[PDB]
Amino acid sequence: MNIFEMLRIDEGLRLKIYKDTEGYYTIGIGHLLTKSPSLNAAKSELDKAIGRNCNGVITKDEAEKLFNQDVDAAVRGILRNAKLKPVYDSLDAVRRCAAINMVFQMGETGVAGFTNSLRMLQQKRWDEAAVNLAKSRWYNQTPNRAKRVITTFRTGTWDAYK
Ligand SMILES: CC(=O)OCc1ccccc1
Ligand SMILES: [Cl-]
Numbered sequence: 001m002n003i004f005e006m007l008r009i010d011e012g013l014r015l016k017i018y019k020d021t022e023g024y025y026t027i028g029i030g031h032l033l034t035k036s037p038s039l040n041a042a043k044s045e046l047d048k049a050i051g052r053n054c055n056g057v058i059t060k061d062e063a064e065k066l067f068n069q070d071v072d073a074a075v076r077g078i079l080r081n082a083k084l085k086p087v088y089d090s091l092d093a094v095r096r097c098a099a100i101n102m103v104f105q106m107g108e109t110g111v112a113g114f115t116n117s118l119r120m121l122q123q124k125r126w127d128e129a130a131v132n133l134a135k136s137r138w139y140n141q142t143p144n145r146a147k148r149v150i151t152t153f154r155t156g157t158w159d160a161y162k
Contacts, residue, residue: 001158003097005069007104009161010145015086017042017056018149021142028063030104031070038099074103081108083115087122098152103146106138121153130154 013032017039020026021126025033025042033045050062058066078084078099088099102111111118114136127156128136130150133139138145151160 001097001156001161003100004067006101006161007067007071008098009138010101010105010148013060015058015060015063018047027058027066029067029070031063031066042100070104071100074098074100077108083118084108084111087118090097092156094156094158098149101139101149101152103144110138126154 007028012031014027017033018026020030020032024035025034025045026037027046031049033042033049036042043054043056046056046058049066050058069156080132084099084103088096091099114133117129117132120132128151133150133153134146136146139150148160152158
């Protein structure tokens, strides 16, 4: 397993504009287009991202290229963030994937409230970090996704995805 297979399982694949769990227009493998309620704004964001007039539909190749850019962007966001990079560098390869997964879903700002979890992860207090991560809006709104990611942090294995 690797980060691309993990996120493909968590996000699925849809080739037409859809709404995510929060109601935001999204396409492909979890690519957020806009938080605006306007479908026309979302369609404009899509055409800009793809470079052609899509009318709300993309190919599988396009979805996979967007996904590669989005994973790249998540990793770059971790590496440029002075709070996240030291924690990321302390983790093994499997747990790094759980870290990217959370940034992909919530962004650098969505993880800003997780200061206490980050310290426990850096100290390798896995069970304690798992409990702290579950005390969140994230866990309460998307519990199955959160359980898979938390289990990955707790165990350092892919067992939640097998
Ligand atoms: C708050 C959290 O558990 O996010 C995981 C993480 C760890 C290091 C860098 C980015 C995200
Ligand atoms: Cl869920």
